[PDB]
Enzyme design. Structure first.
Site, PDB file in Angstrom:
ATOM      1  N   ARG A   1      51.797   9.909   8.947  1.00 18.19           N
ATOM      2  CA  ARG A   1      51.794  10.641   7.679  1.00 18.19           C
ATOM      3  C   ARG A   1      53.224  11.006   7.223  1.00 18.19           C
ATOM      4  O   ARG A   1      53.414  11.967   6.474  1.00 18.19           O
ATOM      5  CB  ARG A   1      50.869  11.881   7.721  1.00 18.19           C
TER       6      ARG A   1
ATOM      7  N   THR B   1      54.472   3.646   6.415  1.00 22.32           N
ATOM      8  CA  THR B   1      53.818   2.481   5.780  1.00 22.32           C
ATOM      9  C   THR B   1      54.607   2.100   4.559  1.00 22.32           C
ATOM     10  O   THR B   1      54.908   0.930   4.353  1.00 22.32           O
ATOM     11  CB  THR B   1      52.323   2.707   5.354  1.00 22.32           C
TER      12      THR B   1
ATOM     13  N   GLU C   1      50.461  -2.274  11.998  1.00 25.56           N
ATOM     14  CA  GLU C   1      50.566  -1.627  13.298  1.00 25.56           C
ATOM     15  C   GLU C   1      49.836  -2.545  14.268  1.00 25.56           C
ATOM     16  O   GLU C   1      48.769  -3.064  13.952  1.00 25.56           O
ATOM     17  CB  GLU C   1      49.936  -0.219  13.275  1.00 25.56           C
TER      18      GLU C   1
ATOM     19  N   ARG D   1      59.802  13.222   7.512  1.00 19.94           N
ATOM     20  CA  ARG D   1      59.115  13.943   6.442  1.00 19.94           C
ATOM     21  C   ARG D   1      58.833  15.366   6.884  1.00 19.94           C
ATOM     22  O   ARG D   1      58.339  15.586   8.017  1.00 19.94           O
ATOM     23  CB  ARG D   1      57.799  13.255   6.102  1.00 19.94           C
TER      24      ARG D   1
ATOM     25  N   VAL E   1      50.215   3.480  -0.576  1.00 20.90           N
ATOM     26  CA  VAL E   1      51.072   2.289  -0.332  1.00 20.90           C
ATOM     27  C   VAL E   1      50.857   1.174  -1.373  1.00 20.90           C
ATOM     28  O   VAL E   1      51.827   0.524  -1.809  1.00 20.90           O
ATOM     29  CB  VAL E   1      50.921   1.744   1.155  1.00 20.90           C
TER      30      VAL E   1
ATOM     31  N   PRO F   1      53.340   1.651  -6.490  1.00 23.63           N
ATOM     32  CA  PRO F   1      54.803   1.749  -6.339  1.00 23.63           C
ATOM     33  C   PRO F   1      55.248   3.155  -5.924  1.00 23.63           C
ATOM     34  O   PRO F   1      54.419   4.081  -5.866  1.00 23.63           O
ATOM     35  CB  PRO F   1      55.338   1.416  -7.749  1.00 23.63           C
ATOM     36  N   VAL F   2      56.544   3.295  -5.627  1.00 24.95           N
ATOM     37  CA  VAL F   2      57.160   4.585  -5.277  1.00 24.95           C
ATOM     38  C   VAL F   2      56.755   5.714  -6.273  1.00 24.95           C
ATOM     39  O   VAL F   2      57.331   5.810  -7.366  1.00 24.95           O
ATOM     40  CB  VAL F   2      58.730   4.436  -5.182  1.00 24.95           C
TER      41      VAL F   2
END
Ligand SMILES: Nc1ncnc2c1ncn2[C@@H]1O[C@H](COP(=O)(O)O)[C@@H](OP(=O)(O)O)[C@H]1O
Ligand SMILES: Nc1ncnc2c1ncn2[C@@H]1O[C@H](COP(=O)(O)O)[C@@H](OP(=O)(O)O)[C@H]1O
Lengths: 282, 285
Positions: B18, B22, B39, B123, B222, B225-226
């Protein structure tokens, strides 16, 4: 300069512990062209988990590819080099069908010893194994029984061409005849050193021994008879009684469950003389 | 024809789940030269075991005696891990992998792959612990207090690892910085990796399931986009008491540069590029 790959000729010795497997491999180490070295512990361990796990892209093909490489390195590196590599870890023969798919030119020798000898051995010697409760012969024998049944089933599925059953008592009595056929099945040229393993311990090209492995202080001596039948007399009557229920394998393998002991055979002069030497303290 | 071996240049992505790992990897896969893939689940698995064996006292003694020494183990480890990484996805010039806890053993990993690089995704733990609670081996499903303390212990290890590793091999990558400044972060990362810049990096959403780009598992926890949406959504949902004891539960936030008492800290200001991305996603692109 020794090369090693997926497709090389490998030897895997195994069977239930106390089945003269250390003995078996020690005679192959002595052979110049061959090395087995000690028990790895790790190979069975990584197979046990391998068994267990059978979207991530982690397909059968990958795991296997990863297994190949993993195992190859261990055997290759854990001991002195040779042209023919071999490995001895009793419980490997559990996965032999798989092992044959990985290394399509590996061969397998499955050590078959009267479980009555095996189970006695492990009981008197205190050799703790995977689930084998030392407190009851009944337990141990059932266990031996389940165990052996599987490895054999494997060996049989595998085929006469890749797997060869190897009778400990046949070996102890007639080592010369034995090894001959063994290596023949194996497809390697004869060496007499086999019978003189005792003379190649800690020596190069030869036999490398773990000083904490259990079947050591017996392999130090040459092929001797003393072990074949010392088990008889020690079995709990009721076990002697339920013998063919507890171990129907005995019978299948040609071990007469009610023979106490059976008649295994008659010794070569070679072995007798060796045994004598043993009593004298050579 | 792509070759592979012990010494090639590998990318290890990792960090507490989290934490946008990804995303990180997704953008990496997009690069035509690079492939991380999914993964694997197995690699960290085998490592842990290998750890255990050495982490033993009695089995080592045993194992060495057998001629099975560190070197061999390592040798095997290599051969093993390699294959997985080589085979599990599409072939690439630079190969990368992403399995969160991998970065717990980077010290050892770097010994195994002398030219491997490591990205430690960092994060703020309040956004991860929330993410993980609302949506692992070690963590508890009914306490924020427990989830954080644990995030804490976990991130405390990976960093010390990353630190002993060396700035040169290991690069802390800040999620909020990445999401806020995608062009800036990716420039600084390809740089540290010594990988040529390609524009495909910022356009990762367009390359999922496409050759040379981003391969995904449909059952990983994911596609867009950003976007700015996941940044501060955590704030307000924290039990007041855990917000009170914040600095004791996670002294790590503080040293990482996260204010345990800012609710939230002020992370920074978005690129016009990330805002227009947040806007297309709210519109349904
Ligand atoms: N040179 C030799 N001759 C006969 N038996 C041998 C031997 N070296 C080892 N053994 C036997 O190896 C057996 C244990 O097998 P493994 O090698 O699978 O642990 C032991 O059984 P006992 O314990 O009944 O004597 C031991 O006798
Ligand atoms: N395109 C994108 N833009 C911003 N964040 C993204 C993203 N794709 C994935 N993420 C974030 O990555 C986190 C999961 O990453 P990891 O792979 O490290 O588990 C999620 O946190 P949340 O659960 O708070 O939303 C999610 O928001």
């Amino acid at each position: 300069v020794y090369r090693y790959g997926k497709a090389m000729p490998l030897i895997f010795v195994g069977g239930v512990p106390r089945s003269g497997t250390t003995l078996m491999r020690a005679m192959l180490d002595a052979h110049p062209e061959v090395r087995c070295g000690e028990e790895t512990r790790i190979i069975p361990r990584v197979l046990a988990m391998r068994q267990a796990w059978s979207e991530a892209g982690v397909t059968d093909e990958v795991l296997d590819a990863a297994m190949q490489a993993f195992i190859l390195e261990v055997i290759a590196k854990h001991g002195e080099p040779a042209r023919v590599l071999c490995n001895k870890d009793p419980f490997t023969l559990k996965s032999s069908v798989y092992l044959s798919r990985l290394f399509p030119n590996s061969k397998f020798l499955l050590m078959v010893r009267d479980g009555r000898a095996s189970v006695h051995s492990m009981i008197t010697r205190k050799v703790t194994i995977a689930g084998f409760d030392l407190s009851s012969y009944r337990d141990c024998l059932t266990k031996w029984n389940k165990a052996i049944e599987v490895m054999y089933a494997q060996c049989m599925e595998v085929g006469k061409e890749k797997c060869l059953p190897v009778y400990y008592e046949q070996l102890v009595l007639h080592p010369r005849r034995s090894l001959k056929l063994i290596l023949d099945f194996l497809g390697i040229a004869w060496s007499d050193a086999v019978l003189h393993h005792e003379d190649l311990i800690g020596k190069p090209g030869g036999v490398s021994l773990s000083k904490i492995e259990r079947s050591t202080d017996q392999v130090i001596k040459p092929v001797n008879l003393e072990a074949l039948s010392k088990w008889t007399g020690h079995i709990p009557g009721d076990v002697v009684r339920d013998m063919a229920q507890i171990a129907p394998m005995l019978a299948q393998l040609g071990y007469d469950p009610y023979a106490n002991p059976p008649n295994y055979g008659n010794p070569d002069p070679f072995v007798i003389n060796n045994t004598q030497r043993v009593l004298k303290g050579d």
